[PDB]
Each structure stands twice: as structure tokens, then as C-alpha cells.
Design a protein around this motif. Structure first.
Motif, short mmCIF file in Angstrom:
data_model
loop_
_atom_site.label_atom_id
_atom_site.label_comp_id
_atom_site.label_asym_id
_atom_site.label_seq_id
_atom_site.Cartn_x
_atom_site.Cartn_y
_atom_site.Cartn_z
N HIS A 64 -8.42 3.21 -6.82
CA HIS A 64 -6.99 3.00 -6.65
C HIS A 64 -6.25 4.11 -7.36
O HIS A 64 -5.21 4.59 -6.89
CB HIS A 64 -6.55 1.66 -7.26
CG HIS A 64 -6.88 0.47 -6.41
ND1 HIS A 64 -8.17 0.08 -6.14
CD2 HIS A 64 -6.07 -0.42 -5.79
CE1 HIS A 64 -8.15 -1.00 -5.39
NE2 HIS A 64 -6.89 -1.33 -5.16
N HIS A 90 -12.71 -3.25 -4.13
CA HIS A 90 -12.37 -4.59 -4.61
C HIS A 90 -13.62 -5.46 -4.64
O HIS A 90 -14.11 -5.83 -5.70
CB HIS A 90 -11.31 -5.25 -3.72
CG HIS A 90 -9.90 -4.90 -4.09
ND1 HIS A 90 -9.43 -4.98 -5.38
CD2 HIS A 90 -8.86 -4.49 -3.33
CE1 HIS A 90 -8.16 -4.63 -5.41
NE2 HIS A 90 -7.79 -4.32 -4.18
N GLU A 107 -2.03 2.32 -0.61
CA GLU A 107 -2.11 0.89 -0.87
C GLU A 107 -1.87 0.61 -2.36
O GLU A 107 -1.25 -0.39 -2.73
CB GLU A 107 -3.48 0.36 -0.47
CG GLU A 107 -3.51 -1.15 -0.32
CD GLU A 107 -4.87 -1.74 -0.59
OE1 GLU A 107 -5.33 -1.64 -1.75
OE2 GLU A 107 -5.48 -2.28 0.36
N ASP A 121 0.02 -2.39 -4.36
CA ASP A 121 -0.69 -3.31 -5.23
C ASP A 121 -0.07 -3.30 -6.63
O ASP A 121 -0.17 -4.28 -7.36
CB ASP A 121 -2.18 -2.92 -5.36
CG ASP A 121 -2.92 -2.96 -4.03
OD1 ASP A 121 -2.49 -3.71 -3.13
OD2 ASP A 121 -3.94 -2.25 -3.89
ZN ZN Z 1 -5.87 -3.11 -4.36
#
Ligand code: ZN
Ligand code: HIS
Ligand code: HIS
Ligand code: ZN
Lengths: 434, 431
Positions: free
Chosen positions: A419, B259, B353, B357
């Protein structure tokens, strides 16, 4: 006539008071669940052929064509009186005006420069409506369901009802633009809408209450992946009236009876600061009940009714909020003033001239409401139930750049390297390019 | 790797490609979660403390985390993080506040006043999975809307010991109470309540299989409580054209993949060249991810699909209804109108994304497993309810009386009809 008279709230013990605020409990009947289970699997695996098998042993005239013809509809239409057709048109116009007024305003904001966030709505693509059949056809539900769906923009709206289908239902469906009407009922109709058959289209969501088998069928398909979503769980209907010394006993009583005639399980409650009012309402109810044609239903429902005398209106509101009644009728001098203090109820009616009856049929509000306590979290059926909220965001290079460090820090804190890496790559690309 | 040429696939092979995994729900856990709830409903806290010994070395004493215990944790966190969280909360707060429904107040007819008002869900309980690295971001996502809705009671449960980041997060969003409890028993505690944990009206937040199963059960019980939404594996679908950047696409697929092992990862593009480059970028980036065993496992279910054109990407996306849809095309914005089903949409190359998030402000608690068909992203609405109100004046009622009697009469609802006649006659005598 075999019942109570009145209850003095503060005379009851703390325990008894808590037992009144409670609603009856429902079983599960391992039998009905299994019966409905076999019905659904059967309809999914063998389509219309399966539906006709049920239509067979459940009728003296097995259904042939499942889809009601346009010809049968125009015929039913002509058979209804102009009086009734015009009444439905008034109901639909007001139902339409109220629900149209619930259209969400656009949500489009920049949480910070260059970071644009929106919330847009999309209609549920296909919806199925169920209407029970029988002697007295509650065709008004058709108006309550099809109207909001039409306003939401649903692409497909179809309806199922136990054949033979009354002219009123058929006309109500045509009037609201229902596209297809099918000769199917019970747990089979729910299965047909949920799974689809050669004739019945598979829909995304099913709306409409029904008997025990319809309820169980709706529960089951909402719990299956190959099924469909449903409007809301069912439960016994309820009405709670708050009345002060200024209310008219007959008005109060007529409202308690209106709800009571909806089924032997209806819960009707009266909360009043005046013992005198309670006594008068109890007698008015007895006198009016004696004039009701087929009041066995209303009669049985009244055995579980509760006419409670409280200390004042404040204790009336405290009790009502704890209960969270499906229908709340406020017949007090300062009716509207109390609304603000009402934290939980399905639909509120104010003053002497707002009968529950006016809302069930033509004020414009929806009469499909949460009950059995679901008023604690669920809402009155409205436009939102025929739509979905979707989120959209777009960050510009500038907007993205100013938010990058924050994202990396948080992502790093959650130990989600990928991320974080998704931000870093973009940041380096921007340095490079310029 | 392995590129899928959509149109070289049989119509059947196709739907099989996007199909989501099946369901286990093994009775093993259906029962385990069942006897767990019963026990908690009957023997409250004593039960909860009996379940602490079992799962995890905590032998929980006081279920509620002290105010002192929270202040200590807050001090142990860096300023950089605390500031990061304030940015997130501020943006999230701004987006949800904007969702407030303006009041509905209209006269469908003169004297027939109909309104739609909102009331907050009285009490809500928030569940946050524990572990070494907790996703404390979910706290900001659930507790912020609850704060804005005006919920009177807001509580949170999390497996002990609860990391500082979660405690700080809860406190920052105003959570009132934090409890040292997790799993299927935390859900039962919120649904039924105990001597320490309050019974709530609605429970929010995802978790493992047991948590998921307990939520489903308490949502199906008259004695339990309502839940925010069914669960399912997370999903990401990227639509990329010839102008997209391979590394950007790959980093978004990997973000989703990292994830869990059941994450659904999908790429749709009209250019084989792009699909091939994305697969290579995924390969390169993967080799650098530390905790990347699961990412690789999730990718076993991924699909890199080559379509004939952009329109076909939109068609496939709408059929699937992905939890997260990322549109990395040159005219992304214009495509939005043609998107009929998705949880949250991300437009352009600078909308990863990760932004959603964490701090763009949207909610990352979204519908998945195809539920985007009727369910919506978590928002303000999930923490409140619509209540209608009506008041008919003497004139309004009289103008509608006939219509109501005609309708009630057709449904053979005598009492409904008599309620109107009584009022019409009273008005006639006062006229
Ligand atoms: Zn995420
Ligand atoms: N009371 C009904 C609605 C209704 C139809 N006709 C009269 N009332 C319900 O609970 O939905
Ligand atoms: N991507 C996750 C949310 C998330 C938490 N942390 C990072 N991402 C989801 O929407 O399921
Ligand atoms: Zn009614």
C-alpha cells in the motif's frame, strides 16, 4: 368481553413494566423451514414445470401461462369503477410526490485541494414485488412498492401474486408501470423471483410481506448467494397512540381497531396521562367492535392490547421510545412539539385528523414499515431501498502529492508495504516527469 | 502471468473466469459460534473471562480499558503518526458530514404535510481485529460516521492486548468505551450485553470466520442485534488503457492482494501489450514485498484479461460489480456514468486504492462478494434511520376523506373506513 380494562403503569413493579415493553417471541418450525427449503431448491432446479406441479395440487385449475397477458389486464381494468380508479390515481400522485422529494442531493466535495470525493446513486437494476391474494386484495401495497421503484429508475419491475389475480391488483400494477405480472404465489413465487425460471426473470431484490411461508422463503433467499436481497424482515403489525385529556375517545378507538383488524397478532397500545381517557377509550373500543362485520380478527388482537395510564406525557414519550412502535399516533394538544423527543418510530401521525388509515392509503407516505422492534435500526420503506450509494474519488497530481506522506505513514503503521509502495512509485514518477 | 484473451473464450469459460469462490461455513464453526453466544448470554462476563484463558494469554481481568491505560498508549505513539491520523479523520469527517440528508418537508396536497426525518441509531458497537499489526484505520472509518450521526453510545471491542494505535484511534474519534474482548464472544457481548459490555442496537466491523459467523447469527436472532453488512473476500478490478503505467496498475493489484490469500484481483485492458507489461511489473514488485506469501497466494486467483475495447471493459466490470474499481484510462471521469455497479471508484493514475483506504476521506468499508448489486458503501446512512411524519389539517383531511374511504372499502377494511367516517361526521357537526 373476555379481557382487561386498563393498566396503571406506576402501579406495576419495575419487572412487570419491563415485561410489557417486550414483544412476543416467534418459533422457527423445523417443518416449515424444511418445507420451504425443498420448495426453493425444487423451483431452481426444475423451473416452470415445478411451479405448475405446485399450482396443480394447490388449485382446481392448474395455471397454464405464468405471465398475465396484456389482454387480461385491460379486461380487469374495465371491470373496476371510475370511483376506485380515481381514488388510486390520487393515492399514486401523493405517494409519488413524497418519494420524489426524497431524491438525494449530489454529494461532491474536495476534502482538501485536488482530492475530489463524491457519492452518487445507482438504482437496483431489477426488483420483484410480491402481493398476497385471497378475498380482500390489499392492492394498495402495489402502489407503495411500484411507485418508489419507478422513481428510482429500476430497469425491471415485475410482480407475483397467487392466481386468480384480482382486477384491483392488476390495475394497480398497470397504473404504476409494473412491467410483468406472474401467476405465482407463496414460497414458490419468492423462489421464482430469486432464482428465475423460463418465464420469471431473476431479480436483484424482492419487496413485499406475506404469510409464514413467504416470510421464510424471503429469509432463505436473502441468506443464499444464488438468491436475492429482500426489503426487510417481517413481524406482527403495531400501533401506539399517545393521547392526552383533549383527545376524542372515538378517534383513539377507531385507530386502535384499524390496526387490530390487520391480523390476530397485531399489537395495539394506548399511552395516556388520564385514567378517565383510558376508561372512555376502552368503552368506545367495545362499542365500535360490536359494529364491525367480521371482527373475530380485531377481537383476538385486542386480547393482547395494552391501555396504559401514565404519570404525564413525558413518561408517555419515554415508554414509546423504549418500545419503538411501527405506527405512532399523537393525539395531544401539542402533538408536533413532541416529535423532536421521538427517537424511535416507523411513521408518526399528528393530531385528530391524521388517521393511520390516511397514511396506509393516500397521504403519500409509505405504509411498508419496520415492525417487531426493527424500528431501532431500520427505516420506513423509501426511495433509498430501490437504490445503492456508490463512492467515487479522483486526486489530481497536486492533490495526490500533498496527501502522499500521510498515506505512506499510515500504510507503514499498518505494516502494509504494498500500500505504501503504491504511493512511493507515483511520487517518484512525479519528481522524474518534472 | 498467463494472459486471458477474453474473446477467444467460450461464453461459459468466461463467467467461470470471474466467478467468486464458494462458501464453507462448515457446521464445525456454526455450532462452535452458537454455543459460544448462548454461554455469553447466560453467563456474561464469567463466560468472557473463561474464553480469554482459552484464546490468548491475557486471562482478562477488567474488560474495560482504563482511561490511564489509554493515555499511556497515546504518549508512546509518534507525532508523525498522530498527525497522519488527524489528516485522515478530518478528511473522512468532511466527506461523511456532506452526506447529511437535507430534511424532507412537503404538502403532497394542501393541508397534507408529509416529512422524512432522521434519527441516529441509539447505540453502536465497533469490532476491530487484533494482532501484531492492527489495521487501526478501520477505527477511523467506523467511529467517525457514528460520531457524525449523533449516536448516543459508541463502543469498541478488540482482542487483548490492544495495540496503542487502536486505543489512540478510538480516543481520537470519541469512542466512549473500549473492551478487552474479541472473536465470536465479543460479538455476543455487544449483541446481548454483559455486566461490563453494553447491549447495542447495531454492530459494525469485519473479522475472521468466527466473527463473521457470530455477526450473521446475532443478526438472525430476535435477542441479538443488527449488523452493518454480510462479509466476503475483498476485491479489486483495474481498467487500464494504452496510456496507463504498468507499475501503477501492478502496485494497485498488489495492494489488494497483500491483504489476504482470498483477495480477488482483476485487470481488464484492451491491449495485450499492457496486460503483459503489468504481469511483469507485478512480478518485479512482488519480489520486494516482505510479507508477500499471501500476496502470491491471492494472485493464484487473479485474472489479467485482454478485452477488445474499452466499452467491453466497462461491460465486464458492471457484470462483476467489484468492491473497488480503479479506472486508469485517459478519460476516466467520463466512464463513471456508465459504471452501474461498484463499491468505490478511483479515477486516474493518481488515485491509488491506498488513498481511499487511508485519507481521501471516503469509507473503505465497502460491499463485496457481488453485494454491490443492492448494498452500498458504509456511510452516514448506516448509522441512522429515516422516520416519516405526517399531519393532516382539517381541510387536508376533508379533501382526502372520500379517497381513503373508497380505498379502505375496496380492501374490505371496515375499521379503516370507519376511522374516516367518524372524523368526517365530527367535522360536519362543527362546521
Ligand atoms: Zn487496502
Ligand atoms: N397496515 C398495513 C398496510 C395497510 C394496507 N391497507 C391498510 N393498511 C401494513 O402493515 O403494511
Ligand atoms: N483495502 C481494504 C481496506 C484497507 C485497510 N487498510 C488498507 N486497506 C478493503 O477495502 O477491504
Ligand atoms: Zn392499515
Amino acid at each position: 368481553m373476555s379481557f382487561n380494562t386498563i393498566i396503571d403503569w406506576n402501579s406495576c413493579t419495575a419487572e412487570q413494566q419491563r415485561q410489557l415493553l417486550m414483544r412476543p417471541a416467534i418459533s422457527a418450525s423445523e417443518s416449515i423451514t424444511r418445507t420451504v427449503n425443498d420448495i426453493l431448491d425444487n423451483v431452481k432446479a426444475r423451473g416452470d414445470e415445478a411451479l405448475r406441479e405446485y399450482s396443480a395440487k394447490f388449485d382446481k385449475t392448474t395455471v397454464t401461462a405464468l405471465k398475465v397477458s396484456a389482454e387480461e389486464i385491460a379486461a380487469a381494468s374495465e371491470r373496476l369503477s371510475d370511483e376506485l380508479k380515481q381514488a388510486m390515481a390520487v393515492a399514486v400522485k401523493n405517494i409519488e410526490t413524497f418519494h420524489t422529494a426524497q431524491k438525494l442531493p449530489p454529494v461532491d466535495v474536495e476534502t482538501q485541494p485536488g482530492v475530489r470525493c463524491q457519492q452518487v446513486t445507482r438504482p437496483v437494476a431489477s426488483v420483484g414485488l410480491y402481493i398476497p391474494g385471497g378475498s380482500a386484495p390489499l392492492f394498495s401495497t402495489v402502489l407503495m412498492l411500484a411507485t418508489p421503484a419507478s422513481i428510482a429508475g429500476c430497469k425491471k419491475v415485475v410482480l407475483c401474486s397467487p392466481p386468480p389475480i384480482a382486477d384491483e391488483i392488476l390495475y394497480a400494477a398497470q397504473l404504476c408501470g409494473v412491467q410483468d405480472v406472474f401467476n405465482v404465489g407463496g414460497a414458490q413465487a419468492i423462489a421464482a423471483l430469486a432464482f428465475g425460471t423460463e418465464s420469471v426473470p431473476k431479480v436483484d431484490k424482492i419487496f413485499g410481506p406475506g404469510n409464514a411461508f413467504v416470510t421464510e422463503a424471503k429469509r432463505q433467499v436473502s441468506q443464499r448467494l444464488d438468491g436475492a436481497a429482500i426489503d426487510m424482515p417481517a413481524g406482527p403489525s403495531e400501533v401506539l397512540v399517545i393521547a392526552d385529556s383533549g383527545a376524542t375517545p372515538d378517534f383513539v378507538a377507531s385507530d386502535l381497531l384499524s390496526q387490530a383488524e390487520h391480523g390476530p397478532d397485531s399489537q395495539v397500545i394506548l399511552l395516556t396521562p388520564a385514567a378517565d381517557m383510558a376508561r372512555r377509550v376502552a368503552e368506545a373500543v367495545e362499542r365500535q367492535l360490536a359494529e364491525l362485520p367480521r371482527a373475530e380478527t380485531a377481537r383476538q388482537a385486542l386480547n393482547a392490547s395494552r391501555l396504559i395510564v401514565t404519570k404525564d406525557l413525558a413518561q408517555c414519550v419515554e415508554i414509546s421510545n423504549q418500545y419503538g412502535p411501527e405506527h405512532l399516533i399523537i393525539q395531544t394538544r401539542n402533538a408536533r412539539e413532541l416529535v423532536d423527543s421521538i427517537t424511535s418510530a416507523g411513521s408518526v401521525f399528528l393530531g385528530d385528523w391524521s388517521p393511520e388509515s390516511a397514511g396506509d392509503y393516500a397521504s403519500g407516505t409509505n405504509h411498508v414499515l419496520p415492525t417487531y422492534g426493527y424500528t431501532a435500526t431500520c427505516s420506513s420503506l423509501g426511495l433509498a431501498d430501490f437504490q445503492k450509494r456508490m463512492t467515487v474519488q479522483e486526486l489530481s497530481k497536486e492533490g495526490f502529492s500533498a496527501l502522499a506522506s500521510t498515506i505512506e505513514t499510515l500504510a507503514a503503521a499498518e505494516r502494509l508495504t504494498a500500500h505504501k509502495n503504491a504511493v512511493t512509485l507515483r511520487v517518484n514518477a512525479l519528481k522524474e516527469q518534472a
